[PDB]
Amino acid sequence: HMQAPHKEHLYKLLVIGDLGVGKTSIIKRYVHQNFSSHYRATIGVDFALKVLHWDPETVVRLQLWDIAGLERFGNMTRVYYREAMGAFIVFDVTRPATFEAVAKWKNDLDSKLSLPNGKPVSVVLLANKCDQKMDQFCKEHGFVGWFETSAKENINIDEASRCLVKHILANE
């Protein structure tokens, strides 16, 4: 006797934000349980896979697209965004200018990507490096929620991803 296979959801998720805010470190902590203090800049886009045992009958596979910080100044984001179901937009709490870039990334995303029915994709805001007004910002810029995160100390990355996936499931 075999047990029945689990239902599966496969989601391509974007991780965007300006240089050095911690996008790659968030993904590396989430998927590989690892962190590095050395800064190695992403070139173009890198990828990582997260398998989530969502509930006893369900598996969620996340294809994470780790986009480099300078790409909002290029012309590749529309290609990079294609077929994504959700995104994290990231800034660095220690460098407030990176918060000002959050709206630029959000407008870039919303102008180049929408769900098949025309609804904008689910987006969660990550205030990263928290180891070192937000509600109003999320309501005014169309975010489903926000979290203080730390790739170094592993704070709220699991929680923020679960929040994003919950919203994606609810809007399919």
Ligand SMILES: Nc1nc2c(ncn2[C@@H]2O[C@H](COP(=O)(O)OP(=O)(O)OP(=O)(O)O)[C@@H](O)[C@H]2O)c(=O)[nH]1
């Ligand atoms: N203290 C602290 N440092 C962090 C955290 N996350 C990332 N860093 C550091 O911030 C620097 C930049 O991290 P990256 O993950 O490479 O940032 P990025 O957004 O991927 O940068 P680009 O790929 O160039 O756009 C690295 O030195 C990391 O060690 C964090 O949560 N806390």
Ligand SMILES: [Mg+2]
């Ligand atoms: Mg990177």
